[PDB]
Design a protein around this nucleic acid. Structure first.
Ligand SMILES: [Mg+2]
Ligand SMILES: [Mg+2]
Ligand SMILES: [Mg+2]
Ligand SMILES: [Mg+2]
Ligand SMILES: [Mg+2]
Ligand SMILES: [Mg+2]
Ligand SMILES: [Mg+2]
Ligand SMILES: [Mg+2]
Ligand SMILES: [Mg+2]
Ligand SMILES: [Mg+2]
Ligand SMILES: [Mg+2]
Ligand SMILES: [Mg+2]
Ligand SMILES: [Mg+2]
Ligand SMILES: [Mg+2]
Ligand SMILES: [Mg+2]
Ligand SMILES: [Mg+2]
Ligand SMILES: [Mg+2]
Ligand SMILES: [Mg+2]
Ligand SMILES: [Mg+2]
Ligand SMILES: [Mg+2]
Ligand SMILES: [Mg+2]
Ligand SMILES: [Mg+2]
Ligand SMILES: [Mg+2]
Ligand SMILES: [Mg+2]
Ligand SMILES: [Mg+2]
Ligand SMILES: [Mg+2]
Ligand SMILES: [Mg+2]
Ligand SMILES: [Mg+2]
Ligand SMILES: [Mg+2]
Ligand SMILES: [Mg+2]
Ligand SMILES: [Mg+2]
Ligand SMILES: [Mg+2]
Ligand SMILES: [Mg+2]
Ligand SMILES: [Mg+2]
Ligand SMILES: [Mg+2]
Ligand SMILES: [Mg+2]
Ligand SMILES: [Mg+2]
Ligand SMILES: [Mg+2]
Ligand SMILES: [Mg+2]
Ligand SMILES: [Mg+2]
Ligand SMILES: [Mg+2]
Ligand SMILES: [Mg+2]
Ligand SMILES: [Mg+2]
Ligand SMILES: [Mg+2]
Ligand SMILES: [Mg+2]
Ligand SMILES: [Mg+2]
Ligand SMILES: [Mg+2]
Ligand SMILES: [Mg+2]
Ligand SMILES: [Mg+2]
Ligand SMILES: [Mg+2]
Ligand SMILES: [Mg+2]
Ligand SMILES: [Mg+2]
Ligand SMILES: [Mg+2]
Ligand SMILES: [Mg+2]
Ligand SMILES: [Mg+2]
Ligand SMILES: [Mg+2]
Ligand SMILES: [Mg+2]
Ligand SMILES: [Mg+2]
Ligand SMILES: [Mg+2]
Ligand SMILES: [Mg+2]
Ligand SMILES: [Mg+2]
Ligand SMILES: [Mg+2]
Ligand SMILES: [Mg+2]
Ligand SMILES: [Mg+2]
Ligand SMILES: [Mg+2]
Ligand SMILES: [Mg+2]
Ligand SMILES: [Mg+2]
Ligand SMILES: [Mg+2]
Ligand SMILES: [Mg+2]
Ligand SMILES: [Mg+2]
Ligand SMILES: [Mg+2]
Ligand SMILES: [Mg+2]
Ligand SMILES: [Mg+2]
Lengths: 18, 46, 95, 62, 126
RNA sequence: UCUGUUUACCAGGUCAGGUCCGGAAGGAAGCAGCCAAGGCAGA
RNA sequence: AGGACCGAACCGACUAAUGUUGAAAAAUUAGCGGAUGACUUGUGGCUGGGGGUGAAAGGCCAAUCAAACCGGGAGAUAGCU
RNA sequence: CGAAGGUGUGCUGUGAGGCAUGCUGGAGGUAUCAGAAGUGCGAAUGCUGACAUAAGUAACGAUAAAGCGGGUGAAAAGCCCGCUCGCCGGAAGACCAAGGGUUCCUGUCCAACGUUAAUCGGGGCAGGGUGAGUCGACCCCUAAGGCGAGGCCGAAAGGCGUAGUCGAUGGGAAACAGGUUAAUAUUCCUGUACUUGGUGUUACUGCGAAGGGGGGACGGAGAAGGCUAUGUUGGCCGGGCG
RNA sequence: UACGGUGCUGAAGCAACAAAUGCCCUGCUUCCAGGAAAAGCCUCUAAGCAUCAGGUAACAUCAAAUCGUACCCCAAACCG
């Protein structure tokens, strides 16, 4: 849902550029 | 108490503004002296 | 008006939450335009370049902020913002 | 260029100029949407414009 | 709250589905600003993450702030890796504590929308 | 001496995950979880 | 009717104390005078130093006035320290 | 294989001084006899910088006043949340002009700044934010006053002023209620309007100015009648039996 | 309901009284110290122009440019 897409998206991704 | 500087823009610019200087011989001498000392701004303009 | 002037008016799409809000809800787009352009010329230029129907253009001027870089005091440049109302039968193109 | 443009008439040059401004417009559009990779393009066109204009003048001038 | 228990289960539920070619194509705004090939090695790094979070005692996970020099020697020894990697894994966990406490305070829309992509001057990448 | 629960690495055993050696066969040091065990208690 | 009376805003500054390296380079607190007029206040203008302006105290002219301020003569002069 | 300079130590000259040398320093120094001097400092209420002293003293800006629970957090007397307490209320409230110029709103940070801490801020960094035919400025018109073609005057510069042309603090067309933003709204949105111009048609038609006349167009004091904003009570409607 | 709000629905919506320093009123009465200018605005015509032009009314139609607009203003943002 919304908290699973806000979990996974910025988890995988915002672990990428940082 | 009431101090000496009570600011006004229209006053400021009619008294010391660019055009006000340029009006007269003396003023253009001011602007001469300033341009000769090489100021950042000559007059008071915005 | 000449077209040559037109293509020089519109700098950039303005992106922000307010922008998106109006674009969705009221059918309106937000533009950074040349500081000197007028409501006439912006109406003309959108109607021409995006080929869609403009109702009215409201504008404002943004004074750039004042910044410090390494103690030095600079001044970000001014610019002009335009709220551009599209007639409702239109749907947006971005080219 | 500039030999290439020199051999074209004034009309074809006006037309090229307009193409160029369309291309330029389109470009800084892409660049302000963050959709540009190749920045070097802006300079390319921004300068070509000048080239064209500088010709128009001398064709009117003399 | 948010622990390395919920981070353990976050990353062990995410080591089933996690991939770098399926999740660098589910966002159009973050793969055009930072490079599209800086994503991750998902299987290597998530099996690393799960390894390192297996090397912990359970109150070292439920209370991540008590992990010190000896704890990181023991964790880095447990899974066969470097103390620096465990350092950067507890770093990653710290960033995610930041983000999910921020998602706790701010409404889901105002903390997902105010999210910013950042460069050091307007010129591309420097 | 049963039961309740406590003690990160630096007492023990199992040692998942992961990691070293090997092409492979397999070994191995051992983090966690568990049981001894040591704190402290119901008897 | 009134340079009338009592009295707030408003204008002022009579006494007392505090303050006196102040909360303030002239104030505060408690009282005091005028308060429909020779009143009071806003915006703008005018008068320039051997001059202004003064219900006149040598008062006032940017916290500097028995002759403003700034630059010049100028390194005035100093039988004085 | 260690110059100048810094720091010691030892020796030597009647004295200003000289020599040697341990450490420091890391690249310049200079015998001899001459030459030229910005040539020697403790004072000048000397000039600049640095560091003392009083002293961890005085002081921390209105004697309107705080208390507790929870949250955040490395750390909460001061921040956010809730609850009681207290002060202003012809203001310590709300809206402008002036003046300022981003201080507005969000996120983030706590060195310096804030007379203490500060997680907070009018502080730092990044982003956003100011939407007008009818609100102002512009614009039309003039006041005092200014500038002022020709002109009069004046050693030169310049002074005065005519026709003009500027100059608001004054005169000149027109929009309201409601809804909305984290931050604009008489501007955006909903509804309902209004004014002045341009072109067009149609019907009618003497139209024309820098000239003429009206209008615009004006004091103080007073009086008190008509009202409205507004408020109080009742009716009304919703809830309450504590 | 992310506990920040979003959406739907929506009662009554009157009367008496009091009442300004606001409005009627740039009025009215009185006094003497006798209380701006000019344009928009209405009308009269000269030069002129006359079936042109131009004026009046209704309907249609277009235009209304630009700049200010945040926030503070009995003040921690103005003058000290
Ligand atoms: Mg509009
Ligand atoms: Mg505007
Ligand atoms: Mg600039
Ligand atoms: Mg006064
Ligand atoms: Mg006096
Ligand atoms: Mg008093
Ligand atoms: Mg009194
Ligand atoms: Mg008396
Ligand atoms: Mg009295
Ligand atoms: Mg007066
Ligand atoms: Mg006097
Ligand atoms: Mg004085
Ligand atoms: Mg004098
Ligand atoms: Mg004299
Ligand atoms: Mg002399
Ligand atoms: Mg002397
Ligand atoms: Mg002499
Ligand atoms: Mg040495
Ligand atoms: Mg030596
Ligand atoms: Mg030397
Ligand atoms: Mg030496
Ligand atoms: Mg030496
Ligand atoms: Mg050395
Ligand atoms: Mg050395
Ligand atoms: Mg020497
Ligand atoms: Mg010598
Ligand atoms: Mg000397
Ligand atoms: Mg000395
Ligand atoms: Mg001496
Ligand atoms: Mg002294
Ligand atoms: Mg120094
Ligand atoms: Mg001292
Ligand atoms: Mg001391
Ligand atoms: Mg003492
Ligand atoms: Mg004492
Ligand atoms: Mg004191
Ligand atoms: Mg004390
Ligand atoms: Mg205080
Ligand atoms: Mg607390
Ligand atoms: Mg507390
Ligand atoms: Mg307090
Ligand atoms: Mg509270
Ligand atoms: Mg009172
Ligand atoms: Mg003023
Ligand atoms: Mg302003
Ligand atoms: Mg700032
Ligand atoms: Mg703020
Ligand atoms: Mg903030
Ligand atoms: Mg501090
Ligand atoms: Mg403290
Ligand atoms: Mg601290
Ligand atoms: Mg700030
Ligand atoms: Mg108006
Ligand atoms: Mg005049
Ligand atoms: Mg002349
Ligand atoms: Mg004159
Ligand atoms: Mg004029
Ligand atoms: Mg003006
Ligand atoms: Mg005005
Ligand atoms: Mg006006
Ligand atoms: Mg506001
Ligand atoms: Mg007339
Ligand atoms: Mg009048
Ligand atoms: Mg009268
Ligand atoms: Mg009524
Ligand atoms: Mg009932
Ligand atoms: Mg009144
Ligand atoms: Mg009044
Ligand atoms: Mg506004
Ligand atoms: Mg406002
Ligand atoms: Mg005031
Ligand atoms: Mg106030
Ligand atoms: Mg101040």
């Amino acid at each position: 849902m919304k908290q699973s897409t806000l979990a996974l998206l910025l988890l995988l991704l915002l672990l990428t550029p940082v | 108490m009431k101090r000496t500087f009570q600011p006004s823009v229209l006053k400021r610019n009619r008294s010391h503004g660019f055009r006000a200087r340029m009006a007269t011989k003396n003023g253009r001498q001011v602007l001469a002296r300033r341009r000769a000392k090489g100021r950042a701004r000559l007059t008071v303009s915005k | 008006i000449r077209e040559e002037r037109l293509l020089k008016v519109l700098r950039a799409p303005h992106v922000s939450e307010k922008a998106s809000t109006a674009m969705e809800k009221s059918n309106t787009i937000v533009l950074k335009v040349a500081k000197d352009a007028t409501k006439a010329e912006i109406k003309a230029a959108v109607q021409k370049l995006f080929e869609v129907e403009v109702e009215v253009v409201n504008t404002l001027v943004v004074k750039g902020k004042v910044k410090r870089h390494g103690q030095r005091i600079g001044r970000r440049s001014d610019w002009k913002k335009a709220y551009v109302t599209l007639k409702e039968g239109q749907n947006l193109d971005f080219v | 260029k500039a030999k290439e443009l020199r051999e074209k008439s004034v009309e074809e040059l006006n037309t090229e100029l307009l193409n160029l401004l369309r291309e330029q417009f389109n470009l800084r559009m892409q660049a302000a949407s963050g959709q540009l990779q190749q920045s070097h393009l802006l300079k390319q066109v921004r300068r070509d414009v000048a080239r064209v204009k500088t010709l128009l003048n001398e064709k009117a001038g003399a | 709250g948010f622990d390395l228990n919920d981070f353990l289960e976050q990353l062990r539920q995410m080591k089933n589905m996690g991939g770098x070619x399926x999740x660098x194509x589910x966002x159009x705004x973050x793969x055009x600003x930072x490079x599209x090939x800086x994503x991750x090695x998902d299987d290597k790094v998530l099996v690393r993450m799960e390894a390192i979070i297996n090397s912990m005692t359970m109150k070292e996970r439920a209370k991540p702030e008590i992990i010190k020099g000896s704890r990181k020697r023991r964790i880095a020894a447990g899974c066969g890796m470097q103390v620096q990697d465990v350092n950067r894994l507890l770093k990653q966990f710290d960033d995610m504590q930041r983000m999910m406490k921020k998602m706790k305070k701010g409404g889901x829309x105002x903390x997902x929308x105010x999210x910013x992509x950042x460069x050091x001057x307007x010129x591309x990448x420097x």
